[PDB]
Amino acid sequence: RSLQQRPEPTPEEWDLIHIATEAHRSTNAQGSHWKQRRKFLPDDIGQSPIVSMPDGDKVDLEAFSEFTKIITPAITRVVDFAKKLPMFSELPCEDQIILLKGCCMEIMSLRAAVRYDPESDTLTLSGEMAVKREQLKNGGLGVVSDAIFELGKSLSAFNLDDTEVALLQAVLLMSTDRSGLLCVDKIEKSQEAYLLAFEHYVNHRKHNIPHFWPKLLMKVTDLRMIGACHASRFLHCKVECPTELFPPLFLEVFE
Ligand SMILES: N[C@@H](Cc1cc(I)c(Oc2ccc(O)c(I)c2)c(I)c1)C(=O)O
């Protein structure tokens, strides 16, 4: 360890890595059998954008409905992921709440993006619903969909395993650029530990791409950006459409 040229995970990092990975696996829909269980979203759904949005990319109500009918269990599984992480569970529940809201979209988007299928040109939502670029964009997301598609297409070269996704999620979670946090230092400290463990795991993996780590960290920024666009776009939807169309937990996370 450190053994070939680049530092390997420490024993303490191996532990943190194992805990994060299992946290992700146990909360990640349809594990390694998503390619056989997924049903495509019918091609007549997603083609009819008619509710206006401030930026001019309209919303298709039927598609919004399809995506939001399945969103609660998806958000629920991100809450579940976070809770299996000891540095998350031991925070005040105020802090817990703020962190989940700050990273929910980021983690859900990542999870869809790692399930980008090149041959059909689709993302898989919750390991069960394979969607095209147009359907997802028209259903609410607008250009955020082009962003997750663009991220998913570029990640196929990266060959991320379950651990790098889990650690990516954990770094997205433990982030201090949110308003209203109590335990700011404990969070930074916990993020730093994941980042280092992450880096050293990437070292252990020996990817065939040069400069893998900074390339990966740049994919982090893309997610945060996807996250911030969605929070802008969510706010506009809440303005255009009635409450009744939004599942209580969807509202609770993004409102
Ligand atoms: N693929 C994920 C779950 C996941 C689910 C859904 I519904 C998604 O579409 C969204 C999200 C937000 C919105 O505001 C709208 I409208 C749509 C995405 I991107 C991801 C997983 O495996 O957990």
CSV table of C-alpha atoms and ligand atoms in Angstrom, one decimal:
chain,number,residue,atom,x,y,z
A,1,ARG,CA,0.0,0.0,0.0
A,2,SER,CA,1.0,3.3,-1.4
A,3,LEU,CA,2.6,0.2,-3.3
A,4,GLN,CA,3.0,1.0,-7.0
A,5,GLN,CA,3.5,4.7,-7.0
A,6,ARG,CA,0.5,6.5,-5.6
A,7,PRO,CA,-0.9,6.3,-2.1
A,8,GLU,CA,-3.3,3.4,-1.4
A,9,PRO,CA,-6.2,3.6,1.0
A,10,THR,CA,-5.1,3.6,4.6
A,11,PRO,CA,-6.7,0.9,6.9
A,12,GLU,CA,-9.0,3.6,8.2
A,13,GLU,CA,-10.0,4.6,4.7
A,14,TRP,CA,-10.6,1.0,3.6
A,15,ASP,CA,-13.1,0.9,6.6
A,16,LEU,CA,-14.8,4.2,5.4
A,17,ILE,CA,-14.8,2.9,1.8
A,18,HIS,CA,-16.5,-0.4,2.9
A,19,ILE,CA,-19.1,1.5,4.9
A,20,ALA,CA,-20.0,4.0,2.0
A,21,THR,CA,-20.1,1.2,-0.6
A,22,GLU,CA,-22.5,-1.0,1.3
A,23,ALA,CA,-24.5,2.1,2.1
A,24,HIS,CA,-24.9,2.8,-1.7
A,25,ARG,CA,-25.4,-0.9,-2.7
A,26,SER,CA,-28.2,-1.4,-0.2
A,27,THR,CA,-29.9,1.8,-1.3
A,28,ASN,CA,-29.2,1.6,-5.1
A,29,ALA,CA,-32.3,0.4,-7.0
A,30,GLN,CA,-32.2,-2.9,-8.9
A,31,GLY,CA,-28.4,-3.4,-8.2
A,32,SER,CA,-26.6,-5.1,-11.1
A,33,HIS,CA,-29.9,-6.4,-12.8
A,34,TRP,CA,-31.3,-2.9,-14.1
A,35,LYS,CA,-30.6,-3.6,-17.8
A,36,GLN,CA,-33.1,-6.6,-17.8
A,37,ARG,CA,-35.8,-5.1,-15.4
A,38,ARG,CA,-36.1,-1.6,-17.0
A,39,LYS,CA,-39.1,-0.8,-19.1
A,40,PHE,CA,-38.9,2.1,-21.6
A,41,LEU,CA,-41.3,5.1,-21.1
A,42,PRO,CA,-43.8,4.8,-24.0
A,43,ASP,CA,-42.8,6.9,-27.1
A,44,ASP,CA,-46.1,8.8,-27.2
A,45,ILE,CA,-45.3,10.2,-23.7
A,46,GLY,CA,-42.9,13.2,-23.5
A,47,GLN,CA,-43.6,14.7,-26.9
A,48,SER,CA,-46.1,17.4,-25.9
A,49,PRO,CA,-44.5,20.3,-23.9
A,50,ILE,CA,-47.4,22.8,-23.3
A,51,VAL,CA,-47.1,24.5,-19.8
A,52,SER,CA,-44.8,27.6,-20.1
A,53,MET,CA,-41.6,28.2,-18.2
A,54,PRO,CA,-39.7,31.5,-17.7
A,55,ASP,CA,-36.8,30.2,-19.9
A,56,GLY,CA,-39.1,29.0,-22.8
A,57,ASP,CA,-38.6,25.2,-22.5
A,58,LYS,CA,-42.2,24.1,-21.8
A,59,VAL,CA,-43.5,21.3,-19.6
A,60,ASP,CA,-45.5,18.1,-20.6
A,61,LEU,CA,-48.0,17.4,-17.7
A,62,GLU,CA,-48.4,13.7,-18.5
A,63,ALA,CA,-44.5,13.2,-18.5
A,64,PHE,CA,-44.2,15.3,-15.3
A,65,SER,CA,-46.7,13.0,-13.8
A,66,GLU,CA,-44.8,9.8,-14.9
A,67,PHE,CA,-41.5,11.1,-13.5
A,68,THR,CA,-43.1,12.4,-10.2
A,69,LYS,CA,-45.2,9.2,-9.6
A,70,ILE,CA,-41.8,7.3,-9.0
A,71,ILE,CA,-39.8,10.2,-7.4
A,72,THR,CA,-40.7,9.6,-3.7
A,73,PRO,CA,-39.0,6.2,-3.4
A,74,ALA,CA,-36.0,7.6,-5.2
A,75,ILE,CA,-35.6,10.6,-2.9
A,76,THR,CA,-36.3,8.1,0.0
A,77,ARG,CA,-33.3,5.9,-1.1
A,78,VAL,CA,-31.0,9.0,-1.0
A,79,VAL,CA,-32.1,9.7,2.6
A,80,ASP,CA,-31.5,6.0,3.3
A,81,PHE,CA,-28.0,6.2,1.8
A,82,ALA,CA,-27.0,9.2,4.0
A,83,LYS,CA,-28.3,7.5,7.2
A,84,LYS,CA,-26.0,4.5,6.7
A,85,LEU,CA,-23.0,6.8,6.9
A,86,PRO,CA,-21.9,7.3,10.6
A,87,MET,CA,-20.5,10.9,10.0
A,88,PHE,CA,-24.0,11.8,8.7
A,89,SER,CA,-26.2,10.0,11.4
A,90,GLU,CA,-24.3,11.7,14.3
A,91,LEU,CA,-25.1,15.3,13.0
A,92,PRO,CA,-28.0,17.3,14.4
A,93,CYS,CA,-31.1,16.6,12.4
A,94,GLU,CA,-31.3,20.3,11.2
A,95,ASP,CA,-27.9,19.8,9.6
A,96,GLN,CA,-29.1,16.4,8.2
A,97,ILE,CA,-32.1,18.1,6.6
A,98,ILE,CA,-30.0,20.9,5.0
A,99,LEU,CA,-27.4,18.5,3.6
A,100,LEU,CA,-30.1,16.2,2.0
A,101,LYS,CA,-31.8,19.2,0.3
A,102,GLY,CA,-28.4,20.4,-0.9
A,103,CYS,CA,-27.4,17.1,-2.5
A,104,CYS,CA,-30.6,15.2,-3.3
A,105,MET,CA,-30.7,16.2,-7.0
A,106,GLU,CA,-27.0,15.7,-7.3
A,107,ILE,CA,-27.1,12.1,-6.1
A,108,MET,CA,-30.3,11.1,-8.0
A,109,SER,CA,-28.7,12.7,-11.2
A,110,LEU,CA,-25.5,10.8,-10.7
A,111,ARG,CA,-27.4,7.6,-10.2
A,112,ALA,CA,-29.3,8.1,-13.5
A,113,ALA,CA,-26.1,9.2,-15.3
A,114,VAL,CA,-24.1,6.0,-14.4
A,115,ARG,CA,-27.0,4.1,-16.1
A,116,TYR,CA,-26.6,5.8,-19.3
A,117,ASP,CA,-27.0,3.2,-22.1
A,118,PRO,CA,-25.1,4.2,-25.3
A,119,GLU,CA,-26.7,1.7,-27.7
A,120,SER,CA,-30.4,2.9,-27.1
A,121,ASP,CA,-29.2,6.5,-26.0
A,122,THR,CA,-31.2,6.4,-22.7
A,123,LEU,CA,-30.9,7.1,-19.0
A,124,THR,CA,-32.5,4.6,-16.5
A,125,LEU,CA,-34.6,6.1,-13.8
A,126,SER,CA,-34.7,4.1,-10.6
A,127,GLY,CA,-33.2,1.1,-12.5
A,128,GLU,CA,-36.7,0.6,-14.0
A,129,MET,CA,-37.7,3.4,-16.5
A,130,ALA,CA,-35.5,3.9,-19.5
A,131,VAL,CA,-36.0,7.5,-20.9
A,132,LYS,CA,-34.8,9.4,-24.0
A,133,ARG,CA,-33.3,13.0,-24.0
A,134,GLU,CA,-36.7,14.5,-25.2
A,135,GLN,CA,-39.0,12.8,-22.7
A,136,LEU,CA,-36.9,13.8,-19.7
A,137,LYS,CA,-36.4,17.4,-20.9
A,138,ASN,CA,-40.1,17.8,-21.7
A,139,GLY,CA,-41.2,16.4,-18.3
A,140,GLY,CA,-39.9,19.2,-16.3
A,141,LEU,CA,-36.1,19.2,-16.4
A,142,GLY,CA,-35.5,21.2,-19.5
A,143,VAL,CA,-31.8,21.7,-20.2
A,144,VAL,CA,-30.9,19.9,-16.9
A,145,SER,CA,-31.8,16.7,-18.8
A,146,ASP,CA,-29.3,17.7,-21.6
A,147,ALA,CA,-26.8,18.2,-18.7
A,148,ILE,CA,-27.3,14.7,-17.2
A,149,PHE,CA,-27.2,13.1,-20.6
A,150,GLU,CA,-24.0,14.9,-21.4
A,151,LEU,CA,-22.5,13.8,-17.9
A,152,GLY,CA,-23.7,10.2,-18.5
A,153,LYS,CA,-22.3,9.9,-22.0
A,154,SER,CA,-18.8,11.2,-20.7
A,155,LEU,CA,-18.8,8.8,-17.6
A,156,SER,CA,-18.9,5.7,-19.8
A,157,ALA,CA,-15.2,6.2,-20.5
A,158,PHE,CA,-14.6,6.4,-16.6
A,159,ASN,CA,-15.9,2.9,-15.8
A,160,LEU,CA,-16.9,3.9,-12.3
A,161,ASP,CA,-17.5,1.0,-10.0
A,162,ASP,CA,-20.0,1.0,-7.0
A,163,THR,CA,-17.4,2.4,-4.5
A,164,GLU,CA,-16.4,5.5,-6.6
A,165,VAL,CA,-20.2,6.2,-7.0
A,166,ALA,CA,-20.8,5.7,-3.3
A,167,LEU,CA,-17.8,8.0,-2.5
A,168,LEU,CA,-18.9,10.5,-5.0
A,169,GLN,CA,-22.3,10.6,-3.3
A,170,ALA,CA,-20.7,10.9,0.1
A,171,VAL,CA,-18.6,13.9,-1.0
A,172,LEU,CA,-21.7,15.5,-2.6
A,173,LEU,CA,-23.5,14.9,0.8
A,174,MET,CA,-20.9,16.2,3.1
A,175,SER,CA,-20.7,19.6,1.6
A,176,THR,CA,-20.4,22.9,3.4
A,177,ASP,CA,-21.8,25.4,0.8
A,178,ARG,CA,-25.2,25.5,2.2
A,179,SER,CA,-26.9,28.1,4.4
A,180,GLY,CA,-27.8,27.5,8.0
A,181,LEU,CA,-25.4,24.7,9.1
A,182,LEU,CA,-24.5,24.2,12.8
A,183,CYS,CA,-21.5,21.8,12.6
A,184,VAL,CA,-19.6,23.3,9.8
A,185,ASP,CA,-16.2,22.0,10.9
A,186,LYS,CA,-17.3,18.4,11.5
A,187,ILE,CA,-18.8,18.4,8.0
A,188,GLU,CA,-15.6,19.9,6.3
A,189,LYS,CA,-13.5,17.4,8.2
A,190,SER,CA,-15.8,14.5,7.2
A,191,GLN,CA,-15.8,15.7,3.6
A,192,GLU,CA,-11.9,15.9,3.6
A,193,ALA,CA,-11.7,12.3,4.9
A,194,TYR,CA,-14.0,11.1,2.1
A,195,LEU,CA,-12.1,13.1,-0.5
A,196,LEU,CA,-8.8,11.5,0.5
A,197,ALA,CA,-10.2,8.0,0.8
A,198,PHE,CA,-11.8,8.6,-2.7
A,199,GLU,CA,-8.5,9.7,-4.2
A,200,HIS,CA,-6.6,6.8,-2.8
A,201,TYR,CA,-9.3,4.3,-4.0
A,202,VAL,CA,-9.0,5.9,-7.5
A,203,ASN,CA,-5.3,5.3,-7.1
A,204,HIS,CA,-5.9,1.6,-6.2
A,205,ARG,CA,-8.2,1.2,-9.2
A,206,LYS,CA,-5.5,2.2,-11.8
A,207,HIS,CA,-7.8,3.7,-14.5
A,208,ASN,CA,-6.6,3.6,-18.1
A,209,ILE,CA,-7.4,7.4,-18.6
A,210,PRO,CA,-4.5,9.9,-17.8
A,211,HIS,CA,-5.2,12.6,-15.1
A,212,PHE,CA,-8.3,10.5,-13.9
A,213,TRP,CA,-8.8,12.2,-10.5
A,214,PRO,CA,-9.1,16.0,-11.5
A,215,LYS,CA,-11.2,14.8,-14.5
A,216,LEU,CA,-13.5,13.1,-11.9
A,217,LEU,CA,-13.5,16.1,-9.6
A,218,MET,CA,-14.6,18.2,-12.5
A,219,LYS,CA,-17.6,15.8,-12.9
A,220,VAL,CA,-18.4,16.7,-9.2
A,221,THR,CA,-18.7,20.4,-10.3
A,222,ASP,CA,-21.0,19.4,-13.2
A,223,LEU,CA,-23.3,17.6,-10.7
A,224,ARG,CA,-23.4,20.6,-8.4
A,225,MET,CA,-24.3,22.7,-11.4
A,226,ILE,CA,-27.1,20.3,-12.4
A,227,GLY,CA,-28.2,20.5,-8.7
A,228,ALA,CA,-28.3,24.4,-8.8
A,229,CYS,CA,-30.2,24.5,-12.2
A,230,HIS,CA,-32.8,22.1,-11.0
A,231,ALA,CA,-33.4,24.2,-7.8
A,232,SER,CA,-33.9,27.3,-10.1
A,233,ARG,CA,-36.2,25.2,-12.5
A,234,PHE,CA,-38.1,23.7,-9.5
A,235,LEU,CA,-38.9,27.1,-8.1
A,236,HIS,CA,-40.4,28.1,-11.5
A,237,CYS,CA,-42.5,25.0,-11.7
A,238,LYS,CA,-43.9,25.6,-8.3
A,239,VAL,CA,-45.0,29.0,-9.7
A,240,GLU,CA,-46.6,27.6,-12.9
A,241,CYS,CA,-48.4,24.5,-11.6
A,242,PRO,CA,-50.7,23.6,-8.7
A,243,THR,CA,-49.5,21.9,-5.4
A,244,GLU,CA,-51.5,18.8,-6.2
A,245,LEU,CA,-49.2,17.8,-8.9
A,246,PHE,CA,-46.2,17.7,-6.5
A,247,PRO,CA,-45.7,14.6,-4.2
A,248,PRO,CA,-45.4,15.8,-0.5
A,249,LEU,CA,-41.7,14.6,-0.3
A,250,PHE,CA,-40.8,16.2,-3.7
A,251,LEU,CA,-42.1,19.5,-2.3
A,252,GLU,CA,-40.4,19.0,1.1
A,253,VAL,CA,-36.9,18.4,-0.5
A,254,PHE,CA,-36.9,21.1,-3.1
A,255,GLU,CA,-39.2,23.8,-1.6
B,1,LIG,N1,-32.1,7.4,-11.4
B,1,LIG,C1,-32.3,7.7,-10.0
B,1,LIG,C2,-33.6,8.3,-9.6
B,1,LIG,C3,-34.1,9.4,-10.4
B,1,LIG,C4,-35.3,9.8,-10.7
B,1,LIG,C5,-36.0,10.6,-11.3
B,1,LIG,I1,-38.1,10.7,-11.2
B,1,LIG,C6,-35.3,11.5,-12.0
B,1,LIG,O1,-35.9,12.5,-12.8
B,1,LIG,C7,-36.3,13.7,-12.1
B,1,LIG,C8,-35.7,14.2,-11.0
B,1,LIG,C9,-36.3,15.3,-10.8
B,1,LIG,C10,-37.2,16.2,-11.1
B,1,LIG,O2,-37.5,17.5,-10.7
B,1,LIG,C11,-37.8,15.6,-12.2
B,1,LIG,I2,-39.4,16.4,-13.2
B,1,LIG,C12,-37.2,14.5,-12.5
B,1,LIG,C13,-33.8,11.4,-12.0
B,1,LIG,I3,-32.4,12.7,-13.0
B,1,LIG,C14,-33.3,10.3,-11.1
B,1,LIG,C15,-31.9,6.6,-9.1
B,1,LIG,O3,-31.5,5.5,-9.6
B,1,LIG,O4,-32.1,6.7,-7.9
